[PDB]
Amino acid sequence: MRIVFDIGGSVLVPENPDIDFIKEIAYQLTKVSEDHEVAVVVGGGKLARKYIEVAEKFNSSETFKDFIGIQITRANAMLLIAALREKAYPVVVEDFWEAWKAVQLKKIPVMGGTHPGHTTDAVAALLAEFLKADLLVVITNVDGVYTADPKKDPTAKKIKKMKPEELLEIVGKGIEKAGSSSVIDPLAAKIIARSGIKTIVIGKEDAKDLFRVIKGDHNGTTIEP
Amino acid sequence: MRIVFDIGGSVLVPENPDIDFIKEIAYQLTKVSEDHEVAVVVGGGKLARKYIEVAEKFNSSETFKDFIGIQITRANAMLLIAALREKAYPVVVEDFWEAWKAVQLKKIPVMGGTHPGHTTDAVAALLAEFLKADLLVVITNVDGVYTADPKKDPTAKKIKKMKPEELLEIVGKGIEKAGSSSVIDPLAAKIIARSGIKTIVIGKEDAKDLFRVIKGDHNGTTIEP
Amino acid sequence: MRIVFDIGGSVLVPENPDIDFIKEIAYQLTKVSEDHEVAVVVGGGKLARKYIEVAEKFNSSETFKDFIGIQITRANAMLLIAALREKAYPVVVEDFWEAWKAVQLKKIPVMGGTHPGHTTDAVAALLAEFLKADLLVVITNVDGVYTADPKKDPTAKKIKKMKPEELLEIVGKGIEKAGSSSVIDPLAAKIIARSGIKTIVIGKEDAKDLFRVIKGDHNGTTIEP
Amino acid sequence: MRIVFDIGGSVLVPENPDIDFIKEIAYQLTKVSEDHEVAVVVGGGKLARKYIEVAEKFNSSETFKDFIGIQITRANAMLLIAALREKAYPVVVEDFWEAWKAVQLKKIPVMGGTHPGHTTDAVAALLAEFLKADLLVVITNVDGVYTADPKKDPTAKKIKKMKPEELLEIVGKGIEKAGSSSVIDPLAAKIIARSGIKTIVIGKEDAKDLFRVIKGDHNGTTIEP
Amino acid sequence: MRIVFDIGGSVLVPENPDIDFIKEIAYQLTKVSEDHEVAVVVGGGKLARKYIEVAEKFNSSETFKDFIGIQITRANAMLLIAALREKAYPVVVEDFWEAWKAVQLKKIPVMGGTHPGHTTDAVAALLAEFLKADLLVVITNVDGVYTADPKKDPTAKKIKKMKPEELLEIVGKGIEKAGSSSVIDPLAAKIIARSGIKTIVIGKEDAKDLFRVIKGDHNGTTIEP
Amino acid sequence: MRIVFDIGGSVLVPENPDIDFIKEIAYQLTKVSEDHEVAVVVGGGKLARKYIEVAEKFNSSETFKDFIGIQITRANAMLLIAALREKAYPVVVEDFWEAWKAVQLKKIPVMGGTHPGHTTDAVAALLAEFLKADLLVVITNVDGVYTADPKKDPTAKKIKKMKPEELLEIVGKGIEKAGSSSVIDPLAAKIIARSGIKTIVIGKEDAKDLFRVIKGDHNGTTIEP
Ligand SMILES: Nc1ncnc2c1ncn2[C@@H]1O[C@H](COP(=O)(O)OP(=O)(O)NP(=O)(O)O)[C@@H](O)[C@H]1O
Ligand SMILES: Nc1ncnc2c1ncn2[C@@H]1O[C@H](COP(=O)(O)OP(=O)(O)NP(=O)(O)O)[C@@H](O)[C@H]1O
Ligand SMILES: Nc1ncnc2c1ncn2[C@@H]1O[C@H](COP(=O)(O)OP(=O)(O)NP(=O)(O)O)[C@@H](O)[C@H]1O
Ligand SMILES: Nc1ncnc2c1ncn2[C@@H]1O[C@H](COP(=O)(O)OP(=O)(O)NP(=O)(O)O)[C@@H](O)[C@H]1O
Ligand SMILES: Nc1ncnc2c1ncn2[C@@H]1O[C@H](COP(=O)(O)OP(=O)(O)NP(=O)(O)O)[C@@H](O)[C@H]1O
Numbered sequence A, B, C, D, E, F: 001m002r003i004v005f006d007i008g009g010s011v012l013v014p015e016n017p018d019i020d021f022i023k024e025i026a027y028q029l030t031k032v033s034e035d036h037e038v039a040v041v042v043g044g045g046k047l048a049r050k051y052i053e054v055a056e057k058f059n060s061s062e063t064f065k066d067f068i069g070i071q072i073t074r075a076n077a078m079l080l081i082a083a084l085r086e087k088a089y090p091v092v093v094e095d096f097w098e099a100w101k102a103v104q105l106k107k108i109p110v111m112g113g114t115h116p117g118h119t120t121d122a123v124a125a126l127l128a129e130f131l132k133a134d135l136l137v138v139i140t141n142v143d144g145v146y147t148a149d150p151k152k153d154p155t156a157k158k159i160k161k162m163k164p165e166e167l168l169e170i171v172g173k174g175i176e177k178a179g180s181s182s183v184i185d186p187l188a189a190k191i192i193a194r195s196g197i198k199t200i201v202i203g204k205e206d207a208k209d210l211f212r213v214i215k216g217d218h219n220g221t222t223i224e225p
């Protein structure tokens, strides 16, 4: 199976780089690649947000900001590339067809952001469609997908399995949210529907044993028609 | 003042180019650019759609389909440059920084698409925000922004002016209509909404006299806060 | 065997894209690549000529025109890349060494034009020499190579086998024709002589069963010392 | 006159950016650039070191470690540009030729690192030599060039002036200290030694008034022949 | 007026550079460029031929052989730039658009080869057409265009003037002599023929005074319609 | 075993290209690659020095000079690429990760210089570290490493085996020599220490039978902790 991992930056670099988690996920990844094709996309996280802010205080364009965020995601991506030793594609990948080449060479392509105007979630969902992958795996700072924000609405429960259409609902069906953040960012959630690619929304815990996550023996959310 | 023209491909290259119009529009741009900072983003039109449909038939990804789209828009981009002679940038522009330079060399940067995930309208709007443009002139293939697709609900007429919020509704603010065409791409519109940059929408007729157009005298829609 | 296919644009896109032919040639190609190395070069065709004209009406340089033509050939090339599914190199190739890489990865590199100053025939003959290929296959809007223009001179017969020197004659030994069109463009025909690479000039018919075309069981022309 | 500012990353982006200082330093640069040719190379600071240390943990090569470093310096480079608004080059500069252009467009080229094997100081010095700069202003995180690392041997005070040869000794001219940081990178120093270009070393305090600084009035070190 | 100088490599870098001539020719160019738009394409000379011959020995393709050629021409291109100091573009130019920019920044773009399949002469001529140059000055290693290769048929003398058609014959218009050197590359000549741009052919002697040269006063050949 | 060969330009191109040596080393290399991974780095040599000089006479920056030198090393590198037939990576490699790709494709990447500020020795030592190679092989115009310059100090003997620390001594522990030439250039010798990679310093003789050189049955110097 060809699998894509969309690792939220907040998870990889909460405040500083989570050395331990990195070593772990790397290990888990190196593990899964033994008998699967693996592509990864890393998030910017906290550090990204901070750099974005400074730019805001100088009123730079959305485009300009994105570029900065991208620079950062790529800085994080290279941390994993480092942890993955001789198993990952040598340098940060910047576009799908190059990621494709990496897969061909039986190596793990790790991507930061691509071009301006795309959240890591969206970039991941697309890198998936492009590679014609089987599963999209989202590690995030949340247990799974809840009927409502777990960190707010008390009447919020975790959904173990749902259809892309329902996911689009939970997250947000507003063309205003286009580009916002969430369990799964509105635009990515959209693509996932269009693509109908099976997605798993797990957290920092389940990520510890990807083998089970892959085969279902996990405690997250699963999305697919 | 800085203006950004969003010329429809189907307007510059209908089914088979209106050499006359092209010269007319090119000249106009030349004049306007004499006492203005002019940037121009062009469409791929019907030609693009065909090529994209073919790709659609072979179940090619969204990204690949967009590459084809971009590739064609830039073909058209060329024709304009050929028409703008020695006033335009010699090459089609691909990124905003390059477009910025053109402005410095006091030359007109003509762009096609930039990268996947961005309709021409969007690219234009984002450009207008990047360059801090004062106005965004959308020369589409329709008279203006009607209460509904003219070809669909003839119980419609245009709307000389309106709020960005009003626009988002005429084009359906459904997080799924992201990527559609319409008189103005949905996502592009929402971009204008948060940027609040004055946007005019005209047809090829008004397009014949840009000075009158940019000087508020026209028969299209003048969207803004 | 390593084989190069120089598919005339007129054949691929007569007026519009020949969907059927595309699906067929794709199928045939996907077939031949099963036990051969395959590189393709696609032509601009009708659509290319039209865009070139507009540029002429604005008196753009030969160089400028070529670029436009190239843009188009690449647009066509991507149509095949699409039809070839997961067998072709993901994106349009722009230069030999990159095409080389594609061959290494056991994928089919499809090229449009390379740089200004080279017809698809020439680009194909060269891509061949570079890859040190065994056979050059030319699909064109003609049955084969005739003693004279089939669509004019009545005393024109099809030659089943000839030497590169004779081909150079038929086509044209004038350093004035350098860059013109024909069964085989003068410059390409020249290279074919220099390279002495076996070439087969077939048409839209023979292209339907490449297996026989490859092994000789075809009805075209064969060129080789 | 042509001046090249070597702004420390830890000075522009301490642990969390001094928006105030950044505006102050950016403005200053704007003024100075009014009657001077200004080029600016920026550092990655503490942030870079962390990311590099992480890489160090996974035994990544020197080259890869430098890529990460470069990648971060250019993130910072951005923030300055965001601050320099319409006077700076829109993009971070990567090579000197590009930096040269910026100078022509009378814009300020802001650079991060260029390629592996070159500390920020070095890159700056080499730049100053490339552009034939008259002065090299090193705004580090220390008051000046002390007879010894202040944090180490408190029996030290600074040295208002000195010879390039004197500098090489304060930073240990051991062919192994090549790549170290210090108030001024060892290799960078030796570069200044053979180029003999006047170099000032100040802190963020003096950095607040560049006019006074470049006009010899400051409290740092003014290294030269 | 816009002029394009086609400086022979063997003239700028004989067997071992004429520092004197180089300064002389560089200065001249500087003066001429004061009230003219100057573009310069340079050759690889004897040095190129050697390296290419070596490649020839290992049966390397035409394309690869040209890459080596290009690679060397650009080495020379450098030396001129080093000589043109602050008036030339800092980098060797590779494409015409870049050469166009140089013209805008009122700097002299010095080019080597561009891509395979184009002799220096050709590249120059195509450049002259691209930039809409008024004259094409070919500074070859010979006095002028003789009725026959001086080193071959001593029964020859030069021809002060002539028609482009006359040129094509002195260099053999055989569709096989495409790629040869001669006083003027065959293909280059035919390019001049259809472009009909005034072309002067001189030696290093007349080359010493370009003002007199471009002002019709010289002893070479002035080819034109 | 993965092996890197740092072939001194002086050896490859003493005066002119040493055709014979090239054919030999190529043969030897093609031989060793049969059961090893091989990366090569070629030097500029005599020809490089000459071009550098001309630039010096026009007082160009160190950076500018390096670029020229690089151009040349790459010209030499392509000579080997030619000799290596269908065994080497098609074109000259310009950076490590690309060289990495070449190794993956079981091809021999031949590099000239990388970016300014690095001698071929240094570039080689680094390309080694990057690829995590087992042995660094230096062919030079000298028998091996001597206690002192063989071509000067009579009390100079050849050392058959030593530790990187001692090598750093012989060659030079001065941060002033940083960038100079020698058996092993000071900076490269430094890296070799840091990397502790086994290095063999042989000459034009031993290079004739790489199989023995590889397994120790040679007459050069060996460096390793
Ligand atoms: N219905 C929901 N279910 C789960 N999380 C939700 C929901 N609604 C909102 N959220 C929020 O989604 C957050 C999740 O994702 P997010 O903060 O964007 O991190 P990330 O994407 O993992 N990181 P990065 O790529 O660096 O941004 C939670 O911590 C919640 O505050
Ligand atoms: N409310 C509306 N007002 C006007 N046109 C509308 C509206 N709603 C939908 N449309 C459609 O918008 C179409 C307009 O734009 P579109 O087809 O996308 O062309 P274009 O943008 O000019 N060309 P190009 O850049 O090549 O795609 C019309 O012909 C209608 O079918
Ligand atoms: N002796 C000949 N034998 C065969 N065809 C000839 C001959 N002489 C001239 N022709 C012409 O060659 C044409 C063939 O090629 P051409 O029109 O250039 O198409 P193409 O190369 O297949 N397409 P493209 O790559 O898009 O240009 C025919 O249809 C004839 O009009
Ligand atoms: N003789 C000296 N004088 C002053 N500082 C010294 C001296 N010797 C060593 N140092 C050290 O130099 C440090 C200074 O520079 P450095 O840490 O490299 O910061 P930076 O260059 O400003 N930042 P950046 O560009 O992000 O690395 C001090 O804090 C000292 O620990
Ligand atoms: N009719 C002619 N008139 C003058 N030279 C001729 C003629 N026919 C052939 N030649 C040859 O042209 C040679 C001239 O040019 P060429 O050797 O190609 O040098 P170049 O172009 O100056 N150098 P470069 O750019 O490095 O190749 C002479 O030395 C002759 O051998």
Ligand SMILES: Nc1ncnc2c1ncn2[C@@H]1O[C@H](COP(=O)(O)OP(=O)(O)NP(=O)(O)O)[C@@H](O)[C@H]1O
Residues within 6 Å of the ligand: F007, F008, F009, F010, F011, F042, F043, F044, F045, F046, F120, F139, F140, F141, F142, F144, F145, F146, F147, F148, F149, F150, F151, F170, F171, F181, F182, F183
């Ligand atoms: N201790 C030493 N042992 C051996 N050679 C020495 C020593 N000290 C100095 N040398 C010099 O090192 C020279 C060796 O290397 P060098 O001239 O730099 O050639 P290269 O590196 O092989 N070529 P290239 O890559 O083109 O510069 C000899 O010929 C000596 O003049």
Ligand SMILES: [Mg+2]
Residues within 6 Å of the ligand: A008, A121, A140, A182, A183, A184, A185
């Ligand atoms: Mg997320």
Ligand SMILES: [Mg+2]
Residues within 6 Å of the ligand: B121, B140, B181, B182, B183, B184, B185
């Ligand atoms: Mg539209």
Ligand SMILES: [Mg+2]
Residues within 6 Å of the ligand: C008, C121, C140, C182, C183, C184, C185
């Ligand atoms: Mg043809």
Ligand SMILES: [Mg+2]
Residues within 6 Å of the ligand: D121, D140, D181, D182, D183, D184, D185
């Ligand atoms: Mg420092």
Ligand SMILES: [Mg+2]
Residues within 6 Å of the ligand: E121, E140, E181, E182, E183, E184, E185
């Ligand atoms: Mg010549």
Ligand SMILES: [Mg+2]
Residues within 6 Å of the ligand: F008, F121, F140, F182, F183, F184, F185
């Ligand atoms: Mg050496």
